[PDB]
Design a protein around this ligand. Structure first.
Ligand SMILES: [Mg+2]
Ligand SMILES: [Mg+2]
Ligand SMILES: [Mg+2]
Ligand SMILES: [Mg+2]
Ligand SMILES: [Mg+2]
Ligand SMILES: [Mg+2]
Ligand SMILES: [Mg+2]
Ligand SMILES: [Mg+2]
Ligand SMILES: [Mg+2]
Ligand SMILES: [Mg+2]
Ligand SMILES: [Mg+2]
Ligand SMILES: [Mg+2]
Ligand SMILES: [Mg+2]
Ligand SMILES: [Mg+2]
Ligand SMILES: [Mg+2]
Ligand SMILES: [Mg+2]
Ligand SMILES: [Mg+2]
Ligand SMILES: [Mg+2]
Ligand SMILES: [Mg+2]
Ligand SMILES: [Mg+2]
Ligand SMILES: [Mg+2]
Ligand SMILES: [Mg+2]
Ligand SMILES: [Mg+2]
Ligand SMILES: [Mg+2]
Ligand SMILES: [Mg+2]
Ligand SMILES: [Mg+2]
Ligand SMILES: [Mg+2]
Ligand SMILES: [Mg+2]
Ligand SMILES: [Mg+2]
Ligand SMILES: [Mg+2]
Ligand SMILES: [Mg+2]
Ligand SMILES: [Mg+2]
Ligand SMILES: [Mg+2]
Ligand SMILES: [Mg+2]
Ligand SMILES: [Mg+2]
Ligand SMILES: [Mg+2]
Ligand SMILES: [Mg+2]
Ligand SMILES: [Mg+2]
Ligand SMILES: [Mg+2]
Ligand SMILES: [Mg+2]
Ligand SMILES: [Mg+2]
Ligand SMILES: [Mg+2]
Ligand SMILES: [Mg+2]
Ligand SMILES: [Mg+2]
Ligand SMILES: [Mg+2]
Ligand SMILES: [Mg+2]
Ligand SMILES: [Mg+2]
Ligand SMILES: [Mg+2]
Ligand SMILES: [Mg+2]
Ligand SMILES: [Mg+2]
Ligand SMILES: [Mg+2]
Ligand SMILES: [Mg+2]
Ligand SMILES: [Mg+2]
Ligand SMILES: [Mg+2]
Ligand SMILES: [Mg+2]
Ligand SMILES: [Mg+2]
Ligand SMILES: [Mg+2]
Ligand SMILES: [Mg+2]
Ligand SMILES: [Mg+2]
Ligand SMILES: [Mg+2]
Ligand SMILES: [Mg+2]
Ligand SMILES: [Mg+2]
Ligand SMILES: [Mg+2]
Ligand SMILES: [Mg+2]
Ligand SMILES: [Mg+2]
Lengths: 213, 112, 116, 54, 122
RNA sequence: CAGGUGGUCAGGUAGAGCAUACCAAGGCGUACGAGAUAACUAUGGUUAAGGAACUCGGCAAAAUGCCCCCGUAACUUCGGG
RNA sequence: AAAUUCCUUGUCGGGUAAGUUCCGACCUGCACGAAUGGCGUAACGACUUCUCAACUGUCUCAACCAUAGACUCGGCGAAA
RNA sequence: CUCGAUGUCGGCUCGUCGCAUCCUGGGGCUGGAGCAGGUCCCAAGGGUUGGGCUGUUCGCCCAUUAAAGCGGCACGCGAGCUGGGUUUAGAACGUCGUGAGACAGUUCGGUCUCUAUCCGCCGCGCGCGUCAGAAACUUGAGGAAACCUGUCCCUAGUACGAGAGGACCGGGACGGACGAACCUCUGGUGCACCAGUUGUCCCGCCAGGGGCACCGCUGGAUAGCCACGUUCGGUCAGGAUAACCGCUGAAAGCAUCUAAGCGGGAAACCUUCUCCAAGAUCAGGUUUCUCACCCACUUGGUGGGAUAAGGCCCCCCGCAGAACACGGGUUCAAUAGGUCAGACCUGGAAGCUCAGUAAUGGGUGUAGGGAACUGGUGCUAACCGGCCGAAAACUU
């Protein structure tokens, strides 16, 4: 039974616990989801559950996407993702039309948090891959941040594939494992999650229960 | 006003006195030494306030045995028992970093 | 206002202080200015904050406009005629219109003017 | 680094055909009782007499 | 934070006044030592007629640090000099008393003898 | 064409100064532009804690810097240093 | 043991936590030597060499900022 | 092979592979009591330090470490860098030569050029395809990435040992290194922020300000970006195995791990964890939407024209960004700017007034100024619009 919710990174603050230690927390607004679709292995080949999140105006959802919310009896949402389950015991708890709130997670639980990391543009090999670069003095000529060598010589007469070079960095799918759930505020739909969460403030965030605990 | 003010509002400590940089302050710090839970006092000059509400810090500075010491505490921290305002200082800055290179008579603040 | 993200107008940032100060002087004098489009964009929060001083209209607001404008004749008409004209309007005292680009470097031109 | 060989007619033409001007959209304008065509970003100025039609 | 070739003020009456850090003990290729960490050091300056002489290789423990140290309650401590105390191999000081205050992080590092001798443990 | 080319005139405020900073008289904005927060390169600036651990080598950078008053070593060819 | 010493990082003392370089000697001078001068020498050197204080992005270990480029648009338009 | 040029030592940067294994992992034997080892067998997943001396490679040394492995790749790597050394022209010393000069003898000094065409490599788009045209969510064939390890505690001063010493296996705590995300904290930066101040010029003058001097300099500094910072990770469980250890059992009345058959078994291999992924041309799956005209003809699975769903350009912007792309919005609109109030940063504005001979100081007044963050507000610009875009059949 792997649980799961969609939400928004609201940014960071800090809180104190019972032993008066400071706790850096990230505020995820694990908002009220709804199901809209179930994947069964007889129909779909595998087992999962869709989740729909985010208030949107019904004039912004086009006609093909409105007909999919119409078949599930749900007002159209902004985001839509699946929670992949194991093959056994698919949706004996999930029903199409069911509302899911923040308090499926308990205090002291552990969660995997996945999101889209922040865009860093075209990055160089020092920023992107952690290279050292050449020196700043003792004669070094215009190679202070340049990569150095990119291979051998006439054997082999090529550059090997997967060689670390400059290019675009960020905007990746990043999962952070084993984050402590410090507090779930059911009054506001807010999870206080110890540590950092990938993405900018305002971004879509998927919060699943941890497999490694 | 901020987005995360509803998170921080049940965590703020009332009954913290008003003090500016330049004041002389007693800080009553909870200390755990094995299984004793005593209370140690840090007396010094406030040199910094870095704002932010629940994330607001302050720095206090004293001179112990020819060695200057600075402690930085969170305002609204529960390991502070209470804060007592000894002396009101009269300064023109807000960060007072120039006291780090002064000693003795020259490191003394006025009395308003 | 929000500072420039990217290279500043006219090379340095001290040249940009004078480009905004000379364009606001010419705007408040003629009511309408033809310039390149990135300068018309950069003039709009600059010039509207000077009209907000002239709407308040005290001596401390006049000393604050004179920090940016080195021309007393146009400081007069901002406080005597432009400021009292916009007393009933809450922001948005200017307007940018897009013009055909100029021959020679194909720079996108734009005009900027006060509303009525 | 100089070029090693001259390019063939096939290889120089494939690159050179991607140097081409992007045309712009034109919408309709009636000013002073005259039907003209301007690009859409110039539509407000065309209605205010700020555009010369030569 | 103290690494190799840093010079520290010796804060006991062993006879030394200045030591140069050689290693930061506590693992392969460990960079920095803060309050509570053990150093291999050499004596650079010493009082005439002392227990320790210039050129002796000793072991020390850092007790004061100019760089701020985070404590688990969100507090910070900062001194104005980088200081050390020369110790025996059973973590007891070679001297008989400590000068200046010491940081409290020596308590979980089992330096009970230096805490008892110290004038002020913050 | 960022190079080279002898002589004469040479104002103000600060300053020891024909240095330097700002200005006068008088000249000029000098001949591709307009935009845009990519890497990277050049030219500048700043940097916690440490302080030559860098490197063939303190290369480059940083540092010292003025005026008045005290005070000043080995050695020396008696001047110096 | 040298602007000269091959063997060679000779050996001994000093300096360093550690010194094939440096200073002090020793003499076994491969291959020192008295106007192709011998041994000293105050002052002086953009000279070579070794050490110290101060000082720092030289480095541990990099991060940020502005400008001229690179980059987009329009104009002109080469070269190996 | 190359002389109508294939740049030679060391270092730096970035690597990749081998195993003849240095550490960590599994074993056999031992002149293996224990703890430590010696020797052989298996094993390449990760790891494998900082300095002094020398141009050095190498080597010795200092302080550590679980360990400080050995080789290949033009003794990898100069259209990536350095130039100490070798190996031009200057000059000196020793030695040889009558001499000009010479020396794997020494010494000091001595220009490192190039706008990347093609393949390769890192990124990013345009086109067409996937048998109608579109929109949303996905399967994973096959890949990429990652993989390190210590100390103390309990078991236990028990096993073993005359003693000195001192465990395996299991359990727990806190580390070092590396990496990823992030900006709450701390720390850095700050070129339209606030303040102080020097020179000078100007705003007619006073007052209050501005230009210039590296942002003139100095003390601060929200946002963004960041590490010196904060959190998290390499978990555990299988499957098939290596060396090795067996079970049953012949050929060969005994015996034998093997010939039939069945087990145990490691950081290697395959799953599981994270990420890419249908141009995977075998171009997949589940869904939803449009589901429609008109003309000409040589009547063709013809050529046009107009549309639907949908999309694109334009436009307002972005914490998305080289261009492009992606994301948000476009009046039923809070998208950017303005404006109003907060947050925060600076630190007590101007004018008036009182005190002092004045420099200055108190009051008015947590003042005034102000960018990034949050919220209201329909004031400005998101417009009175263009371009694209839907189907022969037949066989069973
Ligand atoms: Mg960016
Ligand atoms: Mg570097
Ligand atoms: Mg160059
Ligand atoms: Mg350079
Ligand atoms: Mg090459
Ligand atoms: Mg504050
Ligand atoms: Mg900026
Ligand atoms: Mg330009
Ligand atoms: Mg300036
Ligand atoms: Mg000329
Ligand atoms: Mg001349
Ligand atoms: Mg003069
Ligand atoms: Mg001059
Ligand atoms: Mg010219
Ligand atoms: Mg830039
Ligand atoms: Mg520094
Ligand atoms: Mg410092
Ligand atoms: Mg020092
Ligand atoms: Mg030194
Ligand atoms: Mg060195
Ligand atoms: Mg070195
Ligand atoms: Mg220099
Ligand atoms: Mg300098
Ligand atoms: Mg001398
Ligand atoms: Mg010798
Ligand atoms: Mg010598
Ligand atoms: Mg000698
Ligand atoms: Mg002879
Ligand atoms: Mg003679
Ligand atoms: Mg002679
Ligand atoms: Mg002579
Ligand atoms: Mg001379
Ligand atoms: Mg280095
Ligand atoms: Mg062009
Ligand atoms: Mg050839
Ligand atoms: Mg290798
Ligand atoms: Mg083997
Ligand atoms: Mg063995
Ligand atoms: Mg390996
Ligand atoms: Mg593996
Ligand atoms: Mg040295
Ligand atoms: Mg080679
Ligand atoms: Mg090699
Ligand atoms: Mg080389
Ligand atoms: Mg002769
Ligand atoms: Mg030769
Ligand atoms: Mg040489
Ligand atoms: Mg290139
Ligand atoms: Mg696969
Ligand atoms: Mg990163
Ligand atoms: Mg913040
Ligand atoms: Mg900070
Ligand atoms: Mg200002
Ligand atoms: Mg004045
Ligand atoms: Mg001027
Ligand atoms: Mg900040
Ligand atoms: Mg296994
Ligand atoms: Mg996917
Ligand atoms: Mg393939
Ligand atoms: Mg498909
Ligand atoms: Mg869009
Ligand atoms: Mg405001
Ligand atoms: Mg006042
Ligand atoms: Mg008076
Ligand atoms: Mg006053």
């Amino acid at each position: 039974a792997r649980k799961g919710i969609l939400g928004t990174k609201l940014g960071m603050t800090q809180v104190f616990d019972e032993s008066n230690r400071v706790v850096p927390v990230t505020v995820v607004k694990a908002g009220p989801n709804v199901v809209t679709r179930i994947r069964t292995p007889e129909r779909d080949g595998y087992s999962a559950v869709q989740l729909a999140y985010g208030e949107i105006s019904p004039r912004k959802v086009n006609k093909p996407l409105t007909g999919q919310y119409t078949a599930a009896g749900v007002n159209p949402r902004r985001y839509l993702a699946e929670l992949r389950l194991d093959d056994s015991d698919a949706a004996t708890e999930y029903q199409v039309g069911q509302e899911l709130t923040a308090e499926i997670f308990a205090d002291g639980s552990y969660v995997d948090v996945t999101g889209t990391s922040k865009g860093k543009g075209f990055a160089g090999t020092m920023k992107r891959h952690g290279f050292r670069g050449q020196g700043a003095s003792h004669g070094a000529q215009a190679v202070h941040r340049r990569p150095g060598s990119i291979g051998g010589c006439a054997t082999p007469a090529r550059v090997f594939k997967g060689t670390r070079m400059a290019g675009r960095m960020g905007n990746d799918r990043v999962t952070v494992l084993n984050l402590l759930v410090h507090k779930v505020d059911a009054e506001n739909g807010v999870l206080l999650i110890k540590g950092a969460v990938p993405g900018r403030t305002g971004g879509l965030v998927m919060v699943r229960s941890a497999i490694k605990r | 006003m901020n987005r995360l003010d509803f998170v921080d509002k049940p965590s703020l400590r009332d009954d913290i006195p008003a003090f500016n940089p330049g004041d002389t302050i007693n800080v009553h710090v909870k200390v755990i030494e094995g299984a004793k839970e005593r209370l140690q006092v840090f007396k010094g000059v406030v040199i910094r306030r870095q704002g932010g509400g629940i994330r607001e810090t302050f720095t206090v500075r004293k001179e112990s045995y020819g060695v200057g010491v600075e402690r930085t505490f969170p305002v609204h921290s529960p390991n502070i028992d209470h804060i007592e305002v000894v002396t009101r200082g009269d300064v023109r800055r807000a960060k007072l970093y120039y006291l780090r290179e002064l000693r003795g008579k020259k490191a003394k603040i006025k009395e308003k | 206002p929000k500072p420039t993200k990217g290279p500043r107008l006219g090379g340095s940032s001290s040249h940009q202080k004078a480009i905004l100060a000379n364009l606001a002087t010419s705007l408040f004098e003629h009511g309408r200015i033809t310039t390149t489009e990135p300068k018309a964009r950069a003039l709009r929060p600059y010039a509207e904050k000077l009209i907000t001083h002239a709407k308040k209209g005290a001596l401390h607001n006049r000393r604050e406009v004179l920090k940016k404008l080195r021309d007393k004749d146009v400081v007069h008409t901002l406080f005597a005629e432009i400021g009292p004209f916009f007393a009933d309007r809450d922001g948005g005292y200017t307007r940018i219109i897009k013009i055909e680009a100029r021959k020679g470097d194909n720079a996108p031109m734009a005009v900027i003017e006060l509303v009525r | 680094a100089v070029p090693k060989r001259r390019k063939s007619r096939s290889n120089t033409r494939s690159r050179r055909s991607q140097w081409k001007a992007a045309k712009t959209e034109l919408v309709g304008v009636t000013v002073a009782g005259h039907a003209h065509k301007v690009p859409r970003r110039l539509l407000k100025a065309a209605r205010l007499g700020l555009i010369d039609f030569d | 934070v103290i690494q190799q070739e840093s010079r520290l003020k010796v804060a006991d009456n062993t006879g030394a006044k200045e030591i140069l850090c050689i290693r930061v003990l506590g693992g392969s290729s460990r960079r920095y030592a803060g309050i509570g960490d053990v150093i291999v050091a050499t004596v650079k300056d010493a009082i005439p007629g002392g227990n320790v002489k210039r050129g002796d290789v000793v072991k020390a423990v850092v007790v004061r640090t100019v760089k701020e140290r985070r404590r688990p309650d969100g507090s910070y401590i900062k001194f104005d000099e980088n200081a050390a105390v020369i110790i025996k191999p059973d973590n007891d000081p070679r001297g008989t008393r400590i000068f200046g205050p010491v940081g409290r992080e020596l308590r979980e590092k089992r330096f009970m003898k230096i805490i008892s001798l110290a004038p002020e443990v913050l």
